[model samples]
Target chain A: MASSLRAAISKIKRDDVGQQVCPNYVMLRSSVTTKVVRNVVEYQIRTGGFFSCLAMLRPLQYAKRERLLGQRNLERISTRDILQTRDLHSLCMPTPDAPMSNHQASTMRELICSYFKVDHADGLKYIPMDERYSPSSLARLFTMGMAGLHITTEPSYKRVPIMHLAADLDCMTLALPYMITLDGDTVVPVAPTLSAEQLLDDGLKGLACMDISYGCSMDSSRCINELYCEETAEAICVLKTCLVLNCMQFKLEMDDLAHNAAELDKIQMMIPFSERVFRMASSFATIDAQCFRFCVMMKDKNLKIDMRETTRLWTRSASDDSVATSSLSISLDRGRWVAADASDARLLVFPIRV
Target chain B: MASSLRAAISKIKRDDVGQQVCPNYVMLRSSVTTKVVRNVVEYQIRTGGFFSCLAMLRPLQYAKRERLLGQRNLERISTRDILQTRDLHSLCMPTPDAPMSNHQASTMRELICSYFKVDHADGLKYIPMDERYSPSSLARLFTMGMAGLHITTEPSYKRVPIMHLAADLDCMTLALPYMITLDGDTVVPVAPTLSAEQLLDDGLKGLACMDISYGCEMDSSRCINELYCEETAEAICVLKTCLVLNCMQFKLEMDDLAHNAAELDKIQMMIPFSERVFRMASSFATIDAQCFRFCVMMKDKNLKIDMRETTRLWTRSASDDSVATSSLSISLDRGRWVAADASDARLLVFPIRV
Candidate 1:
């Protein structure tokens, strides 16, 4: 993040304190600063770091923080306005042998949409730690920006050597599909030291670790989707969530989390997170992040299943949303002010995963 | 359905008319009819079917009358108990990643739990119908329900035949899994059938249909989590609510839903409604036929993903819920009157196709 913004944000503590501070350029920077990474710019204060006043604060685990001043430029551009031309992920809701009735099919569409309202198809793209969350962080987002509505909480996994579980279904769910990106930096956001470190690890110096963050509703009703008919006494959902905190720190954080859900197997508690988010943080020390959200809704009940359709984004920004701001900003770090697909990044580079 | 229970219920519905004319049950009595299917003899009412009630002093749907009883049952049940137990299907607000991070690996333990509060795991279990929607619907949730936080809405998807778009990329969300089942009775509910011809489908036979109802929070602000990075705008989440709702009708009754946001496709709406619910009113052609209901929770947000941890028996009844003194009465029925996994069968057996 830019020094000015970082400095300004390093002041918040509580919701009240945060509101009392800026009330606008929200910044609740909570993230991990891994042992291998730099400290949170917001963490300049020995305390917990900055606070988001109006905007959501993202956490980082010793991960890189972009200059907030020009990070998105989304305020000036609407994703809906720019993403009109982009297209992406989609999938079918697995159904039983009985073909879905037209009603069920239609309900499936609605369910997919409702799923988008909670699961966030666009949010599914980021790489989880394990980047191997194989976690499927960014797969099969309904073309409309939602996960398949008929999803279940059953973990579809197997032992994958030291990597723990092979896949997650839900967001943190077993459907999670982690991967090992031997390719390289897609969204490189690195400083000299960080880039140098990256170079040393995989011979890709300054390789940008573009671990994007997305939000979703953790609606118990929606997450669980009535998969288990067990008599659990009450309604519950298992939608995964995120901190996206600048947790530049990973191993320690993991250890801490393991300590927290201590009763649980350390391997189990970390299923929903992005492999990249976790790995990056683990590699580093901490990150800057603020804001946390969870959406809830009814799942694909018996009546809700899509045989002919999949989940998707209801509205997408025009592929060229930044038409008005091609002056000299977006691509500045990459030494280019505007990208050919400048508007493509209207809202954090569009919700669809690469 | 046991013959004795049916007889008892029949007797109650007919004789229970209060001196002041207990309008609710009176209305219920007029809507249902006894049937001798194969070997069981039971009084079955198409929930949506209607009946003339001297009690309520008007024609009403069995669904409506049943609702009277269901509501009374719910009214009898403490909202506080349900609320404290968090039994309803809904979500609230943001929690820091302090202990509740979104890493799949970190939170998997809680994701697959029956009690997992994560929307992906818990909330989807219950049908989002009207009857089951109790104040404490969100009760008995697991702490893993703390997933789905700090999300950043992915952009709207813009691809066609989206599956092809996914090559080898892992970690992208294909779908959130749940324990959905196709175990309901093949028969569907007839909520009402106020008129002579009300029992039969209007020119249709056993065609199956659906109702995809939209389930969302009345207060969106409560469900948002994630930093906008310097972006100053409300993030949009495209989620296919993973929570499950079963065979139902009339859509989720959101007493507090915002009127302007009622568009079924965009904000929130119903899952595909079941045509089966309508077809079951074959006998009570002239019945009020607007009386079917399903369960739902309007306020779930946190539900974790793939929460597959602890399971429990948290249903409303004892093992033998149907304890009338005359199983012999239902000797003509082919089906056994088994207790439902979650709630009572008061409205469970709705009409179905195949």
Candidate 2:
């Protein structure tokens, strides 16, 4: 009986969403960074893509799947304007096998939205970080401006092994597609020389090490030789990661950050370490027991995941299954143990592993 | 030479800001969960107020500051209602040593509010978490509701010891803050017998561990024994961090969550451990190595820190200083290290570490 109820609630059916039309403008309630990403998720939730009521009476906004994902027809939406073009609500409505009463859907929608209420959507937009955060220091870090929001259907993959560089590279985030480049000259100077000396096992005199500084997004791909310097024999010496400006916790002085970057770069250079923001997890790499440590860093604070504790959090061994969208994933005899998705009312320990 | 310019720019001088009141009405453009906090921070950056200039020029609509904190006076503001109020131009004007004229401040005020920025004041009462996140699961956690935004003078402290039970506590966050309680009868069956045996080390018989299931907030203060049962020899056995609904990455089936709360409790019992959401930070607490492990959890698929990396990130050893308004504090050589206050733009590495 319960299984039937669950099936009735989640049956995925395609409804005629609105005719595809280019978005003339996208409105935003706040220009803080990350608004665009949040908007997409909110829209999905509102339209019953994820958190919408199983029986929502209100017609969900329909978008031509093509229109919603069209990368070319992008524009801005002001708080004052919402183009009268076909809205999704007019296009889609739920069609369930089991008839649900109007009150049932309305009640559910009301209950869910009221509880899981996020601020209203102002048709937010994606803008360069320079528009909101400090501009000059960041300007020299990336080739162009801040990372632009990409709402395309293209799936984002992981960058475990730093491969060929992208044309425009300068951002650090997981789940979204990103491109990072290494400019030995500009970024290398930022790392402390003493530490840099220790990081490169290869001598620094004749060998100019790779300098990995933070910042950027890329489009077309480029070769390592072409992106950095083809003249050097040292191959890339360091990997740089950056967090774009919109982050809520982004706080730093221009001068001090400059100094700390150089100082910390020395450590990474000496030890050759890679990290994910603040989260740290250890995936034992087979390369002679060498390991890949995923950790988040406070660029300015000089703090990082302690090497000893990374393995303790992994409930099981690292797994081959890589798509758990988590801070730490490891293979285990039982299964791949990924942290529980927070929205799941269930605590973070369901074995979502296959 | 540069010091003079710096002095002129950052002088703690007060400017003549407008005070046009419009019968207590304000408009809001965006409603992302963090908007209010961001606005306050942004305003502080603009006018340099712990919570003053930006708030003043914007006439905080006299709501008995008590109301916003009362869990009652949270009235909503719409653009139409704002149209009836005086224009933004008339309310604020600048007068600096440098007559920085030519539509600078007005342009900014307009730009900031263009996409419809968030409006403030009201003493935005901390309504039940009911207003934003999903309700039922979080309903039982608080008594009078999460402490309404205490932007007031009361400094916030940390909770490392997880000792005696408290009567009330409230806080607001966009990402994660959860709890999980356990009823011995329902929870014991889920845990492996060996582990459950270890967890009940303190002889918590007939006493169901109060698994304060994830989510919810509360008001002022109360007695420890009043909220929970006073008869038990031991207080609530554990502290379950929760990621309430409405958080961007919250993902879970209500029923599954209900059942899993019981299952996951078993793990914590069989093998005891503590964790942070995404980052595993160890500044080491020598309270007998009653070690605390920090692990950042991935909130959701779409909602996550970018893969690019964030300068807004941090890693550190917890310091003796406790009131950094967050989970951890950093120190160097006993004093050089500082606690990070993201609201303060002066970065953490400066001699600001005391």
Candidate 3:
């Protein structure tokens, strides 16, 4: 996962870096009662199978986005039940209320010989996402259900499921949908890169040209120097490789973005997701696909950390007044980082400038 | 009850009529939760048998007062079983969790014919008081239990058991009490007259000077015109003639009364118990003592009424500014008013220069 994440970061550099300073990537701010933006974006990923996605949220605009998520039938279900069903058809397309589609339910019973076991890293035995986590919780494994049905050993996520931009993460709470339809041909996301940053910086346009595929970084450091090292990175990876249906189109009117961005800037600061921070990235890939990349910025800078050996930590501005890069790291899968690395040791990477 | 109420009103005029206008009477407010003042006052009336009492209250202050009332011991009981007991000792005393007292419970089983009956007006069957009421709910019929134990044919209460007052007729709510100890001695109120009006009028002094005994004129349109006329009036009658140990002492601190009254006025108008508006008064008498007379002002002056052929109605301010009296007639014991009067009427009276 680390190597793949590094590769994706490397890919971003190789494909689209250096034209502009990366605009700090933004996660939807958490609302008091709602899930964050990343959670809802992942909602699209799990059910829609889009490889990449993005969204933008405002202070009270969560209601609008949530309504859109609900407009598509979604349901929240226990993970235990999702695993018991055991097949892509049964697990992906489902009724609004069932964990997975009826097809997923029936296929599991007949395909005993088709099941594959994880040689090392990990797959099953996971807790379902809840109100507590951002949609980012499912960035790595949500696609496993669909992939397990086809591939024998590796679970590769090919398309970017969603992209969103918003002033606050709270908006994602409303879009949060846990259940999906197995129909497969729903509105899968394209290269939808969104920045929830209040300031409509030019870098958002620069972030637009970044690639969208990522991997379980076998050992990509120089492979992808400063890449998302945590769940957040997976979000970047997924957003990078997400499927581009092209039926959907996004036009960034810099003027309009700036207008709204100025208003958002005038607003007060909101609460953050955590205290100690590092670039959080996760890893995944599409069949025969190269890793992709994107960038995000942390709002808080008082964050102070001491990176140990094998650790590369990033910091925000030295003082409160300036704009500086913020970082938080997330692991895609538990224990080991890749499918073929010699040690299979877990690796995390924070992109220097993606 | 009408004859007695009329008689007491007449008594008030003949005995203590004159110079200053009595702006009615008010009692200290009851807390929102506990029933206190009424319980203790009535306690003396039941065991000590004091007669005729009255109180005053202002709009929302009742909520605060009721809370205090509830802060003390209070319990709610239904009517079904109290009727089955058939006697005072049993009826008046029960577990603390029950509405009454410890002594009344034990002594009840041993007493033969300890119960009394009503020849005319009413009998057992009533609901105990609760925080939900505006305190005015007790103006009538609530006391059939105690009154039933007295008069042979129609239970005639020989004591004034309770007194209350409120603005727009809602203030009484704060002082309503359900249970009382049979123990005689406690803090018996001497004089507490409040208008809830912005001005601390001299009329309050006159209301204080007025004797507590009262009556309902059968023929005297001049009898008790300024009365609650209904259940409340009966409460006055019962209190006026009620047994008094005389061990009770009441001293008034006009300063303290004035302070509370001012604070109460600063507060916003309180919600009434319900939409109904009517003056609620009752009757009572102390041992060897004539009934006592008390009056209270209504907060809402929109009240206006005409003196019909048999009715003598009083209006507050014709333009809704002055203190006008609104009346609701409560039947003390049922049969006597209908069975005895040549008019068989619900008579009300207005005191002349009393």
Ten residues in sequence with the least summed lDDT for candidate 1 chain B: B305-314
Q: Each model's fnat?
A: 0.00, 0.00, 0.00
Give the per-residue Cα lDDT of candidate 3 at A322.
31
Q: Write the per-residue lDDT of candidate 1 for residues B1-354, one digit (tens) a residue.
A: 569877887765345222221012111112234468899865443332121111111001101222112223333333343232211111211111101112121122232232222354223233121213321111111111212111111211111111100111111211111111123754232222121112113321111121111111211111111212122111111110111111111111111111223221231211111122222221111122222111100001111211011000101111223122122111101221111323433222221110
* Top model number, TM-score: 1
Per-residue lDDT of model 1, residues A253-292, tens digit only: 3223333332122222222122222222221211121100
Distance from true location, Cα of A347 in model 3, Å: 22
Candidate 3 per-residue lDDT, tens place, B166-276, comes to 111221212221111122653232211222111112422222222221222312121111343353443333332111101011101112323334433422122221111
Worst 10 residues of 2 chain B by lDDT: B285-294
Off by over 4 Å in 2: A1-354, B1-227, B230-243, B246-354
Best by lDDT: 3
**Candidate 3 off by > 4 Å:** A1-354, B1-354
TM match of model 1 to true structure: 0.18
Ranked by lDDT, the better of candidates 2 and 3 is 3
